[PDB]
Amino acid sequence: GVKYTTLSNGVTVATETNPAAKTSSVGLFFGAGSRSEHSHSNGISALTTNVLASQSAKGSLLTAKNDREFNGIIAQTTNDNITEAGKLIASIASNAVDIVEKTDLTKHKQYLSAQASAVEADPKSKVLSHLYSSAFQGYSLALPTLGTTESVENLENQDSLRHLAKHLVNNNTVIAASGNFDHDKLADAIEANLKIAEGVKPEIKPASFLGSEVRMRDDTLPKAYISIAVHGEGLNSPNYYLAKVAAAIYGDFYLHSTIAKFTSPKLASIVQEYNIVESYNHYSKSFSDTGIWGYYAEIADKFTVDDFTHFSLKEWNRLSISISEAEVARAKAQVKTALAKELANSFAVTSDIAEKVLLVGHRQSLREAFEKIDAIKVNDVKEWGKSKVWDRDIVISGTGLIEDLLDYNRNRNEMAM
Amino acid sequence: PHTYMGWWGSLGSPKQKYITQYTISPYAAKPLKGAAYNAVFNTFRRTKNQFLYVAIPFVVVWSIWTRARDYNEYLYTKEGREELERVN
């Protein structure tokens, strides 16, 4: 029941209503993440959402969804209480400016700054967060999704109120839902309670990929954390699933897992000849129009970072040459399962349906995605590999024990032979 | 092997956690950004800074050499013949 409803105003209510859903959630999203911020006001999108999500809930679970592109509040409740959750967020949104005007941001700013620092403490999130920025340095997409401590500390109610009035508008806002409930009852409940100001959809600020390396050599950490990625296909790109399939070819790995010695990806067998890497993760992060395709890796040995990058990048070369049908068949199946896994929780699908409805304007159910992935031949992957991987610029990030990570030229040269 | 230089994993450098490095893929950068300005302004700056240390010793040595060469030439010309006999 993916059906959509457009209110008297231009707000679209998209609901993935489905029986046998364990719990139901509703969330109002407006397409203004760190993408639509600038360094002086960075993190305002997260701060304003946290304030709204901090409002008292009538037994519902208000949580804030913060992302590079989109941002909104999500309420999760039992299927019988969904209508109350819907009326709740409309009350939160209609009173958004009034709530923010009187709200004291000091406590929320501490929470947001604490979040951002905690992101920096975790090496993976730091590496990924730096990676995304280094690729898009100079554009708004480089801004951290939750902002930075110094940027947040300068935020004031005026900054957010300007932000909400710019972005929290009918054309730039969507309502998402999922669970076992009647779509019409939710839509009627929202219409009778949601009152928001009209406005034009803010133009999405452009961003362009720039191959670069950002090194945060941190010799006190026990392991070396690195990520290397290229300009992968983003949303609304015909290769969006193809990029995911390519990533699943190399898949994941964790040296201390029972599956390590028996996992399919070629790179997994290669790295164990010397226990080169403890864990690595191939991913295809996709934004509204830009995506980053690559891997994240944690190396627990100072002397094997260069060995890993050499072998991992050498394996990337096989995308354009000698890629096996078995791998593509494996990657197609693995992505399909991973795609379906993401959409299990009603909360997860509510976030997903909001993302697509905002950033691409239409959504594909698992039926369509499976029909697309199933049609991916080996050749299509190889053409994609040559287009997006072979001799294409890489962006490199790394924080711990980076001393062995050879400089950019060495790694980049491995991308072609 | 307490070599004061090790391999890449441990080059013997001390802990340097709080420093960050930044570079752009050469596939994205200019090769000749500073070539024109550098070859003139920067080269002249280096030459001017290092000049005195080359000039002063060179002036001293070349002055001594010129004095010696001129004296020898005078000796081997006719007007110096007698002194060539006197010195030898």
Swiss-Prot record, chain A:
Keyword Oxidoreductase: no
Induction data: Expression is induced in the presence of amphotericin B. Expression is repressed by niric oxide and during spider biofilm formation. Expression is also repressed by HAP43.
Upper lineage: Eukaryota, Fungi, Dikarya, Ascomycota, Saccharomycotina
Knockout-associated phenotype: Leads to decreased vegetative growth on several carbon sources including maltose, citrate and acetate.
PANTHER family xrefs: CYTOCHROME B-C1 COMPLEX SUBUNIT 1, MITOCHONDRIAL, METALLOPROTEASE
Superkingdom of origin organism: Eukaryota
Similarity-based family: Belongs to the peptidase M16 family. UQCRC1/QCR1 subfamily.
Protein name: Cytochrome b-c1 complex reductase subunit, mitochondrial
Bilayer topology annotation: Peripheral membrane protein
Curated annotation (Swiss-Prot), chain B:
Induction, per UniProt: Expression is up-regulated in cells that undergo morphogenesis to form pseudohyphal cells when co-incubated with macrophages. The promoter contains the conserved motif 5'-TGAAAA(G/T)GAAG-3' found in morphogenesis up-regulated genes involved in energy generation including ATP2, ATP3, ATP4, ATP20, QCR8, COX4, and SDH1. Expression is repressed during formation os spider biofilm. Expression is repressed by HAP43.
UniProt entry tagged with the keyword Signal: no
Membrane topology, record value: Single-pass membrane protein
InterPro entries for the chain: Cyt_bc1_su8, Cyt_bc1_su8_sf
GO CC terms, sorted: mitochondrial inner membrane; plasma membrane; respiratory chain complex III
SUPFAM superfamilies recorded: Ubiquinone-binding protein QP-C of cytochrome bc1 complex (Ubiquinol-cytochrome c reductase)
Transmembrane segments: 51-68
Domain of life: Eukaryota
Keywords, sorted A to Z: Electron transport, Membrane, Mitochondrion, Mitochondrion inner membrane, Respiratory chain, Transmembrane, Transmembrane helix, Transport
Subcellular location: Membrane; Mitochondrion inner membrane
Phenotype on disruption: Leads to decreased vegetative growth on several carbon sources including maltose, citrate and acetate.
Functional note: Component of the ubiquinol-cytochrome c oxidoreductase, a multisubunit transmembrane complex that is part of the mitochondrial electron transport chain which drives oxidative phosphorylation. The complex plays an important role in the uptake of multiple carbon sources present in different host niches.
Family: Belongs to the UQCRQ/QCR8 family.
Protein name per UniProt: Cytochrome b-c1 complex subunit 8, mitochondrial
Lineage: Eukaryota, Fungi, Dikarya, Ascomycota, Saccharomycotina
